[PDB]
């Protein structure tokens, strides 16, 4: 039997194509774009380009926003720091620990929300981000509903488009209760959010904060990632998505033939 004619299967793991595509992410940093409320948020370009180059085109990654207002002028929020915490995500959402960033450097700043990539550009804010942003507000009173925002960095073809949303009161009480993770949850309305004004600037620079002993990418070590995990922070810049120390299994499974 067997067949007149048969072949042998060759493994083609999907992360290899994404890793090759992740190498060209710097080209998108040459074409980033932006899409009222009361608060104006200013994002420095140096940390945003770095946030793009360390991301994945399908697996979403997220970072926490921190900053202050200009000296004698409180109607504007200047984003000053992006914090990378142990995380793993999919094409629709990301999974952060329950603990918020804690460090002396950030005690002189206020939390301004979070920023995350996403594959496809959508005209409306995700139902998962409404659930995530509201559940963070329920567990952390330091996240004001009129101050914290959600910045979406959607991978448009050969470019990057930025959109910033805040949460309405109507959307907060629904995101905290929601347990449906689908795309059309029960009680999801466009009145749950409004768009905040966002401006990129080159006149000042931000900085990054990464875990002390760990790294941030757990998309290849999801077993070690737990929502109750703890972490400290250091003043350093994050590594790329497919850096060597983010996927040890790939290097040693090749060592043991």
């Amino acid at each position: 039997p067997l067949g007149s004619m048969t072949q042998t299967f060759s493994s083609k793991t999907e992360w290899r194509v994404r890793a090759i595509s992740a190498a060209n992410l710097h080209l998108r940093t040459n074409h980033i774009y932006v899409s009222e409320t009361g608060y104006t948020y200013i994002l420095p370009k140096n940390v945003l380009k770095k946030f793009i180059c360390i991301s994945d085109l399908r697996a979403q990654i997220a970072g926490y926003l921190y900053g202050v207002s200009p000296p004698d002028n409180p109607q504007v929020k200047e984003i000053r720091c992006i914090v990378m915490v142990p995380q793993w995500g999919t094409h629709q959402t990301v999974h952060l620990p329950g603990q918020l960033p804690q460090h002396e450097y950030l005690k002189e700043m206020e939390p301004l929300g979070w920023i995350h990539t996403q594959p496809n550009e959508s005209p409306q804010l995700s139902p998962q981000d409404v659930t995530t942003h509201a559940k963070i507000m329920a567990d952390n009173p330091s996240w004001d509903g009129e101050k914290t925002i959600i910045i979406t960095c959607s991978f448009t073809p050969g470019s990057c488009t930025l959109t910033a949303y805040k949460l309405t009161p109507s959307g907060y009480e629904w995101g905290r209760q929601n347990t449906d993770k689908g795309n059309n949850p029960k009680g999801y309305l466009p009145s749950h959010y409004e768009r905040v004004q966002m401006l990129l600037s080159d006149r000042f620079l931000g900085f990054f904060m990464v875990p002390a002993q760990s790294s941030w990418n757990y998309n290849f070590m999801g077993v070690r990632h737990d929502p109750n995990m703890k972490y400290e922070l250091q003043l350093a810049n994050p590594k790329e998505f497919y850096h060597e120390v983010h996927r040890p299994s790939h290097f040693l499974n090749f060592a043991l033939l």
Partner: protein
Amino acid sequence: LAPRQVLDLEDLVFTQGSHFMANKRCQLPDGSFRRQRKGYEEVHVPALKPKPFGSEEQLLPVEKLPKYAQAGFEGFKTLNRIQSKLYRAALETDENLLLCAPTGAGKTNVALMCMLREIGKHINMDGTINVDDFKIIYIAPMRSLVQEMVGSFGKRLATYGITVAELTGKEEISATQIIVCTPEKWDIITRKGTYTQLVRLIILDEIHLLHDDRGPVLEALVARAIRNIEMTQEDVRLIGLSATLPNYEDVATFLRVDPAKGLFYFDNSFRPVPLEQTYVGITEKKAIKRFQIMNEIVYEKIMEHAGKNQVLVFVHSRKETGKTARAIRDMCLEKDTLGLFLREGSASTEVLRTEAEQCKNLELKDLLPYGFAIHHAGMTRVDRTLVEDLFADKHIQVLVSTATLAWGVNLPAHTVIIKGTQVYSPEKGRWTELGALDILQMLGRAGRPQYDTKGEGILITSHGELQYYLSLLNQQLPIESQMVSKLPDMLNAEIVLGNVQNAKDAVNWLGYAYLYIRMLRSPTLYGISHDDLKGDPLLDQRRLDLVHTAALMLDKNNLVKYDKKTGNFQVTELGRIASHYYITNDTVQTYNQLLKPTLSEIELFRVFSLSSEFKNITVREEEKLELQKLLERVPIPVKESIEEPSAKINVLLQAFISQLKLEGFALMADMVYVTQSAGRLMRAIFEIVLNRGWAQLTDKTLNLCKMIDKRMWQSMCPLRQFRKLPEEVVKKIEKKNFPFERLYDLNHNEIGELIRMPKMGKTIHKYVHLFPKLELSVHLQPITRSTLKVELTITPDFQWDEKVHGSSEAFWILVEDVDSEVILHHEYFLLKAKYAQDEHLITFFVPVFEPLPPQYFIRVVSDRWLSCETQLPVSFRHLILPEKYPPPTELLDLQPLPVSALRNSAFESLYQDKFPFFNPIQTQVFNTVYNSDDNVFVGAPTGSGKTICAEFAILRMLLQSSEGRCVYITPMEALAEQVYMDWYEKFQDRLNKKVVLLTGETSTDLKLLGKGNIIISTPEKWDILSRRWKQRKNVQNINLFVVDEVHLIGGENGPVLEVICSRMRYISSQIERPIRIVALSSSLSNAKDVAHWLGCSATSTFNFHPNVRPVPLELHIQGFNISHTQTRLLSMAKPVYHAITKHSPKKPVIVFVPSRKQTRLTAIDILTTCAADIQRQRFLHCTEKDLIPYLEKLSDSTLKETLLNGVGYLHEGLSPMERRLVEQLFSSGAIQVVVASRSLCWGMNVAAHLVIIMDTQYYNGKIHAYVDYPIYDVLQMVGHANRPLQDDEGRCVIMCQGSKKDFFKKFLYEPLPVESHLDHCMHDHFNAEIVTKTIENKQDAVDYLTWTFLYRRMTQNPNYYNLQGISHRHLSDHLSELVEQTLSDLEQSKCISIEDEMDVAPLNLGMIAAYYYINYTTIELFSMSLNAKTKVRGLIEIISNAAEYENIPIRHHEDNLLRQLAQKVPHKLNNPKFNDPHVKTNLLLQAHLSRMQLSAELQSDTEEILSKAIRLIQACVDVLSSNGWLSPALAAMELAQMVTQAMWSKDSYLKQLPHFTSEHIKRCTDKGVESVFDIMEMEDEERNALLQLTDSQIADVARFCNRYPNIELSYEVVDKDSIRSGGPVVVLVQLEREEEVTGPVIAPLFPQKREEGWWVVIGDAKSNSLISIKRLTLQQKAKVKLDFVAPATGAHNYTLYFMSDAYMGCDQEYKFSVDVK
């Protein structure tokens, strides 16, 4: 000249390499026959008979050799035939030799005989060898042969005390005298360009490698050295050893060998063992049946010698050894023919069985009992030695091995079989024939020189290759040139070295290669017509076409910038890296194309896989299955498909890091070649991306370099790098998901519950702290709001184990920006083992902007250890930037002030003939300096005429007080000598005043300021006299105090300048009559600080900026990308000439070069470019014939030739007279260009129109590193581009490194900020102020600091001095801490006494150090080393260990000089370590007392040492006498006169008088003269005969007699009767000279003049007790009064000593008794 044709180099390449057969036929010796058989054909060549001893050549016994060369031949009784024919040319001549003889004739001993001659050239009086005098290079083809020759040459020459070593992959090269290397190794070394100048002999063993593909390496080595001989005239001897091949006469011409002297050819008949040849050429072309035909022939040949002779079989792979050995044996017992090899009952059989048990090897275990064995590099070291031992003992019968055994071991065999001649070439990606060198070496082992009367060599190959190997082994394979293939790479290597700067240099250089000789003798073989050969008889056009073709290929690949018409070559950083890292030019082109800072690790591996070194690698169809298995699982993804060879190279590299063994035989050989080349390839990519500042890619490539060397990725546990570990635990530690950082702060046994092995407990804790780890701390020092000076502190936090860390550990200090994207600064850090526990300080500058970035990053990454890094974030959140500097003093549009405005006829006579009116800057400050007494500050650029500004204040002082006294301070001694010459004519020759210059010798320095009206001095020179201001009136009576160049306060010797000016202010506050202070400075950013510190009113503060210079300054700053200093200096050579022809084609030019050697090299380079321009003698504006009156006064021959073409040079090694001749010819306009060294920038009395600063770095021989120019030196150099009454402008071009360009723009276009560093050297000044009672408590010390500049700057820039606030409590604590720390160290060294932690008081030690101006550390080491039993030998030792002698340079080209000087020096020292400046100082001291003439630098080094010896000698005198020690004090007192007159205590006193020769004093030591007074009392016509001197030498002898001390001593004990114990005993001593003195001490061998000092010592001789001592200076009459207390009751006898400090033989002794009731 220019008839170029672009050639096709690849079509000129002999593709077969060493297998190329130039001879079309091959004649066989008589008796050779052939036999046709099945499937193959055999060719036999009979053994040649030796040539009967031709003429008078007898075998020379070893005892008939020269006496010194017989130790290298102990163990030999008589030289063989070729050695006895060569020993005379080898040992008795320096002629270049070429020896051609068959393999085994004994060519090595001939090369040894020439090595012995070179070593004999450095015989020592001691009897040893001056090893730092020469160097020998032995070039050997194979690495295995190199290692064995290191041991052989090491043993044969061990009795000579000589180091022979092989170079590691660099203190060893200096330690070795005979370097043994491969041609490629020595090529890489000399490509960089060190210690290659000491090479006197080069031996090119197996020089017939020229025919091989590696041949061009030998051509490059020879052409480089021979051409270097012409431009250096330091001859090098060339010794070539060759086999018997044609064209040996062409090789002789190539080595510059005289055929009638150095050529020696011995045919194959001189083989010591006759050789019967057998060549088996197989006709079967089918691989399978040809394989069995091969195995059938070896069996038939083995059986012919089975039981009769040993057989050595050579295969071409480590795996074939076991296969061939088994395949042979397996067929033997298949035919039952095993009993022939072993007697089955004799001693040979058993010992083959007992060692087969203990052999350990598995493959050899199955073959050793039967008489078989294998040998290859893959086996152990003791197994191979056992195989060699068992075979040498005739136990093994059949040995199958590879070529490594033939090269590395001298293991001959009766019969040798070469099974096949096919080798797999990974470089060529195909199977090729074996190399010619391997064939000759393998068959050379046929026949043992003792047992075998003949050897039997058998070579099996394909039938088509019979003619080749017949030619190779029968003197008929010509040696050709494979040089056209590697020609572009070799031309680039000579361009990077600077040896070839244009095409004509390359055409000349090409004429030294073996290709050129072969092109002349056989042009048809090298694609040249025999008629084109003499349409160009010297092949000028042909070489020029070859150079043109190679230059174009280098230009296209961006290694060289080639000017096609002029022919000039331009080096590039890319072209240098290809040369220094041995990379082909096509590869670095691909690197230049694809390398980008955004590169991923995926593309990085692909970039490596495309290197041209792998251009022949292909993907075989039998490899795709195994390759695809790995491709679908590689950790680094591969974009290319399997069909592409770059994917195969990519996978093979990743498989090598993971340590995976594949099965394909070609894949394994391909993987080795790819990864063997990966080392230098990836290291080249690292240096490219590092110097470009690409932070992310640098980290990627540096890791890949270590992952290739360590063979592990980053994901693994870093403990794998410890090879000494039972591995299966670190793989479990990797399984344990926890970071390696958590193991440091952890128990020695909490490790065991974590990894499951308390079993292997503290074993892990050992290697955790053996892993290198460094801790970093930073102190930010802001210079401006644009620049920050970072002081990085590196503290090691691991432990050194030489078995793990070796002798040093290398690290990379990296300073990255905010985004980890740009490397703002980087440098190389080497942690030596001797400093493995001490902190390290690193200082560098970084730029900053004013939306101050969040933070920078400092990364210290190890160079070889994987995952070995410490990153320190540098936050700027609390960084306090200094305030912006105020706007400058605007230059007023005032009318130019005439010279008549002084309103003084005598004063106007000083400037009337020089210029008509003062410059605008002198115009502004005129009213405040000439018509005012306020303190004035003048800050203007260098060259603004500030010297005249100070002369205004001097001329004003002379009007008020006609005999007033001014003190002028300038920071540099060269500036003081220049100011003294100008102000001597102005104020003394014209105004008839007194102008003096302080000498530094205090013995005649207090005598000038009391004599002169204008005192010119340096800071330290004034500091010693400034300290005693409260008792010496000549310091506080000063009317005017002028300090010049005060901006040097921030320099290395700044604090001394701060102390005196702060002291003059404090003196002026407690002096009733204030002292006027005038400060001159370069343009200062914080000039208001200097004004407020010196009490200058704001209206009298003139702070001008560089834009207001009288002569406008046109500044150009060129950046140069090359990071290699010597290569960067080359890239600036022709730009120096091009800047001259652009900015000053006819006006004078000054060129500043870093070192003394560069002065001559640049002056020749400028003239060579002027020569190629046909502009020769364009810089010569004086007629040639009108210069020889000045020209033939010089000693340097090179200086004469370049001066003949209008180009001079100045350096510290020239004569003091030669410099004045070149300086006068330059200012005269005779010569247009002069090239001055960097160290002469402060004492240059010439100006020019254009100044070119060639580089801003200099090498320091103390720290062994390049040091940047001080910004103060650069400002001084630019100041020379200023001629007020000659040019309308001044121009200066600064050629710097690219990274330093931003620094100069910020600190040259703008005023210079200056800080203070007095807080880093407070001890010596605090001790001085306590001795003179200015500081009596700790509050006084704080009050004392409020008068300084350090102090005021603490509020303007607090972070620079480690302050976090300017609050008046912040600095109050900061001063108190500095006060507490400084006073605690002074009390520790027993110089001050602290009472109740408040009051301080000076001790005897502190009063000595402050008086004689000596460091407090020196006075402490002095106090703990002297006894009552200290003699002259120890006094020289203790003063040599002074801190003032720590910075005496150590030039290690003087090691044997000081080693031999130690033997010539009278006093011998214990523990001779010549790495210490204090030991060298002690040797230079005894060399001066011995009057030993030394080097020009050693004599100069001694001069600077003696300038401090007197004060150190006087210090011990005060220390020894204060402890009642009589004999050492008097000995130290006569050591002072010994140093003065350069004599010893036992030497003759007549050695002081001038012109008294070395021996004609002994002419009269036999008579009755032995004093100077004896010569004084001898009559003319009686005494002018014995002296043997002339009408002028008599007078020098005379004038010493008049000034020689002749004092009449008188002493008196007051009340010689009314004395008893406890009663005062006083003794009056009266001294009076005969006549008197006109002049100081006559001591020509002492640098500084001195005055006659004297001691009066009272002591008890028998008890070594010193009772009373008093210093004094005598002027005609003097009266001294010595007092002490009487001891017990009795009749004690004392002694009165009257000793000088500058003359020997004037001492007086008077014993006297004192009756004490």
